[PDB]
Structure 1
Amino acid sequence: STHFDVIVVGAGSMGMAAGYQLAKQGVKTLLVDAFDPPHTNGSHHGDTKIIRHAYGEGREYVPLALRSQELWYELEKETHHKIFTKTGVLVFGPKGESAFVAETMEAAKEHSLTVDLLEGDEINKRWPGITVPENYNAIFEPNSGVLFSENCIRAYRELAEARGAKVLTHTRVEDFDISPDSVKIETANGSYTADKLIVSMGAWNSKLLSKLNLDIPLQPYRQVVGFFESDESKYSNDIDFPGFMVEVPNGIYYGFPSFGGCGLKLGYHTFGQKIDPDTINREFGVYPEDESNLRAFLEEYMPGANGELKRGAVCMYTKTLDEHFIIDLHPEHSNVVIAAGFSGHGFKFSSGVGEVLSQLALTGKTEHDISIFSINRPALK
């Protein structure tokens, strides 16, 4: 019989940040998650996530990234959990053969961000361990880095509960019942109501937004990462090896320096198996590609980090058709906020999105420019 101000469905990356923002302002909040956040069934585990600022995917992403960065620095000062390490982030690819690299360089020029430009052997000289062809060029952002995602979520969750937020774990929301002046969620453990609703179920948005009369294409992808025994004298954060996102002949890869001897972590971005969140196989290696794709890159570009596989993890991307996020009010219900399809690049923005989501649920508007994320745009189809 407890009526909330706001109910958040899915307390993951976006959800929990949104809950922290709401609780911090005294808004009576209930956060309902299918599991017990942070956990390893969604897309926030794997320990680390890259945060970059020269976002060539859209000028609106830059301010969002820059504001999110400031929010991560604030979070770092408020909790005892480790939030961010300034490893810096390196981007490289074939000179003149990478829209990604070129768009990154343009974004940095356009937004006056601080970056170092280098190419060929300069890359290989600056960062021992990296071996690229002399025809490769790179842009290095020294002030961006790595976020410890599980710590971020755990910190947001602890800060929000200390301010009165309620978290209902291991409870799957099955249906929604929206009325012009209140929202209701349906779960096996009971029904709950509030004045506002935030929906951020990650991969599961591809299966439950239909319950909100929304028919938006969202395709979940199985995306693995691998930790490899590496030459600590080259790939250790301690010796300044950077976080990275690069473009090679067969696609985009991303990785992290070895932290405390955990080994270099790498992930293949351009490819992932299409799956259903409820049946995805979360065992690293069940497929031969899981590991072969990562070693194909390592043996060629960072041969010193191609050692024994120390650890594997399986996580999910949820793509929209244009691969841009969806952050907006529900087209038929102004008391419902949607956050979905972060298509593999949304964690860095989660602190900012948390702010956008709390602004939208409380006022129906946000001070951030989120036009390219409209739920009514045509590219969504």
Structure 2
Amino acid sequence: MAPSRANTKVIVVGGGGTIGSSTALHLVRSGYTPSNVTVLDAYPIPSCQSAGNDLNKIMGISGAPLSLEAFQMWNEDELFKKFFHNTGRLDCAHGEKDIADLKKLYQELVKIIPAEWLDSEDEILKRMPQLTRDQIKGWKAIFMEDGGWLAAAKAIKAIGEYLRDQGVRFGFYGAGSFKQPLLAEGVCIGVETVDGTRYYADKVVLAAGAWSPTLVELQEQCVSKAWVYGHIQLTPEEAARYKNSPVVYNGDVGFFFEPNEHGIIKVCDEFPGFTRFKMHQPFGAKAPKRISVPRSHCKHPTDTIPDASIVRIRRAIATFMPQFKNKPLFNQAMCWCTDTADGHLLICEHPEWKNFYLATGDSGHSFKLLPIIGKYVVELLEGTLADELAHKWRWRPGSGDALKSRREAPAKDLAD
């Protein structure tokens, strides 16, 4: 209560995306005055370039920070709970390596939630009867009742609608696209947009996703990566066969094979596979430098999707729906995330611009934190964030190679 919550003005940059919309929600819920909160985005909530603006994402419990608190809110929170579909979850593994690591995951996971090691092919087929007996020859599996999918875009849109009703201020397009912090004497006092509009506030959050490293100098702590996915379509008859099926994970990769209303199944590549290095000058960089900078999806449908991606996606379809191996993969697209070297979030005060805060480093697995992540960003703004989360999320330039991250390989560049 230096300025009270009630009188403190906050700009959330990227407020039409996952962490940003969460932040704004939690400001309002925390007792910030709605009209004192300004949401700026290049595109109206839900942002058409937001990684979160999807028909569905997969909600799987992990060890990761906040996984279980997020899960709870998806189940209990009155805004979020109509967007989570608890279907149960099945992690499948074939071979020495996968079954080995499935056994490691099981050990960790069974301490956190009920999970069920599935030894027989019969036990597997009872949890998901849409698999065939000889498809799953040699398979083990963890079944967990806890797990499902999230109507991701709908959830952000519901945040947007609540924030509008409460009187949050909004700026989109040229009035929303961040150009620079306003700095007076090492202190951030607001934000200028590309149209020259200047918004003054006590605190500024940059929750710009994969655009974060492109808007402000992040010293390569975050490296933006494109994650390709596509669609197959099933007839109503084929679709009906996948009624009541669970979410399925091949190691670290989740899928969901029950079609939407139009027969569509979204299948993702195994990882963010691709950078788009270009010479670029984020605010705070003395000179241009080679940074991975996203291509907007509200300005790049039908962009050259790497054939490698299409092949891993077809591999996964072959594994889990052999009868559908021949289905054409259409509406191929990329959404962008940004990796830290360690896979943890970057949620910290900027080390030079006081009252400018980073809330990014999503690392391609933060949609599920949408209910809760904004709470912790508010705690950060108020200087009450737990040291454990502060450390995990700290400013940490030169703490590792974000291009590789925790992933098996460095990402290949799209230019190639």
The TM-score bracket by the shorter chain reads: 0.7 to 0.9
**Contact map agreement 2:220 2:397 (CA 8 A) in 1:** no
Matched, 1:205 2:212: yes
Q: Aligned-pair distance for 1:129?
A: 3.1
**Contact map agreement 1:285 1:291 (CA 8 A) in 2:** no
Any gaps of 5 or more consecutive residues in structure 2? 1-6, 277-292, 402-416
Looking at structure 2, the residues matched to 338 and 237 of structure 1 have their Cα atoms a distance apart, in angstroms, of 45
Q: 1:169 aligns with which of 172, 177, 181?
A: 172
Q: 1:188 aligns with which of 180, 183, 194?
A: 194
Could you report, residue by residue, the CA deviation over 1:93-127 in whole angstroms, capped at 9, with x for unpaired residues?
2354137534431322232x112221452324532
Q: Aligned-pair distance for 1:372?
A: 2.2
Q: Aligned-pair distance for 1:147?
A: 0.9
Looking at structure 2, the residues matched to 50 and 368 of structure 1 have their Cα atoms a distance apart, in angstroms, of 29
Matched, 1:47 2:49: no
The structure having more radius of gyration, on CA atoms, is 2
Residue identity in the other structure for 2:261: G
Matches within 5 A, 1:317-356: 317-356=337-376
Looking at structure 2, the residues matched to 196 and 145 of structure 1 have their Cα atoms a distance apart, in angstroms, of 36
Q: Which residue of 2 aligns with 1:257?
A: 258
1:311 and 1:43, CA in 2 relative to 1: closer, same or farther beyond 3 A? same
**Contact map agreement 1:225 1:266 (CA 8 A) in 2:** yes
Looking at structure 2, the residues matched to 167 and 278 of structure 1 have their Cα atoms a distance apart, in angstroms, of 24
SS in 2 for 1:344: coil
Could you report, residue by residue, the CA deviation over 1:243-289 in whole angstroms, capped at 9, with x for unpaired residues?
22213xxx846345223353332111235221221477442664433
Q: 1:301 aligns with which of 317, 320, 335?
A: 320
Q: Greater shift after overlay, 167-176 or 297-306?
A: 297-306
Looking at structure 2, the residues matched to 223 and 70 of structure 1 have their Cα atoms a distance apart, in angstroms, of 27
Could you report, residue by residue, the CA deviation over 1:35-82 in whole angstroms, capped at 9, with x for unpaired residues?
1121332311231111111x14x4xx2xx112112322344x347x94
**Contact map agreement 1:90 1:141 (CA 8 A) in 2:** yes
Looking at structure 2, the residues matched to 304 and 282 of structure 1 have their Cα atoms a distance apart, in angstroms, of 29
Looking at structure 1, the residues matched to 82 and 181 of structure 2 have their Cα atoms a distance apart, in angstroms, of 36
1:100 and 1:145, CA in 2 relative to 1: closer, same or farther beyond 3 A? farther
Looking at structure 1, the residues matched to 262 and 85 of structure 2 have their Cα atoms a distance apart, in angstroms, of 15
Q: 1:217 aligns with which of 221, 228, 246?
A: 221
Q: Which residue of 2 aligns with 1:127?
A: 128
Residue identity in the other structure for 1:324: H
1:146 and 1:162, CA in 2 relative to 1: closer, same or farther beyond 3 A? same
Looking at structure 2, the residues matched to 302 and 206 of structure 1 have their Cα atoms a distance apart, in angstroms, of 38
**Contact map agreement 1:325 1:343 (CA 8 A) in 2:** yes
Q: Greater shift after overlay, 346-355 or 134-143?
A: 134-143
1:234 and 1:127, CA in 2 relative to 1: closer, same or farther beyond 3 A? farther
Q: Which residue of 2 aligns with 1:83?
A: 83
1:314 and 1:135, CA in 2 relative to 1: closer, same or farther beyond 3 A? same
Looking at structure 1, the residues matched to 305 and 387 of structure 2 have their Cα atoms a distance apart, in angstroms, of 42
**Contact map agreement 2:221 2:396 (CA 8 A) in 1:** no
Looking at structure 2, the residues matched to 242 and 376 of structure 1 have their Cα atoms a distance apart, in angstroms, of 38
Q: Which residue of 1 aligns with 2:407?
A: none
Q: 1:66 aligns with which of 52, 68, 88?
A: 68
Q: Which residue of 2 aligns with 1:114?
A: 114
Could you report, residue by residue, the CA deviation over 1:165-224 in whole angstroms, capped at 9, with x for unpaired residues?
1111112111113446652211123111111111110010121221xxx42332222212
**Contact map agreement 1:182 1:193 (CA 8 A) in 2:** no
Looking at structure 2, the residues matched to 21 and 52 of structure 1 have their Cα atoms a distance apart, in angstroms, of 23
Residue identity in the other structure for 2:294: P
Looking at structure 1, the residues matched to 143 and 236 of structure 2 have their Cα atoms a distance apart, in angstroms, of 21
Residue identity in the other structure for 2:190: K
Q: Which residue of 1 aligns with 2:405?
A: none
**Contact map agreement 2:270 2:312 (CA 8 A) in 1:** no
Looking at structure 2, the residues matched to 120 and 294 of structure 1 have their Cα atoms a distance apart, in angstroms, of 27
Q: Greater shift after overlay, 186-195 or 287-296?
A: 287-296
1:369 and 1:162, CA in 2 relative to 1: closer, same or farther beyond 3 A? farther
Looking at structure 2, the residues matched to 256 and 347 of structure 1 have their Cα atoms a distance apart, in angstroms, of 19
Q: Say how many residue pairs are matched.
A: 363
SS in 2 for 1:312: strand
Residue identity in the other structure for 1:134: K
**What is the percentage of aligned positions where both structures have the same residue?**
23
RMSD, matched Cα: 2.9
Looking at structure 2, the residues matched to 215 and 291 of structure 1 have their Cα atoms a distance apart, in angstroms, of 32
Q: Which residue of 2 aligns with 1:243?
A: 247
SS in 2 for 1:97: helix
Looking at structure 2, the residues matched to 238 and 300 of structure 1 have their Cα atoms a distance apart, in angstroms, of 15
Q: Aligned-pair distance for 1:89?
A: 2.1
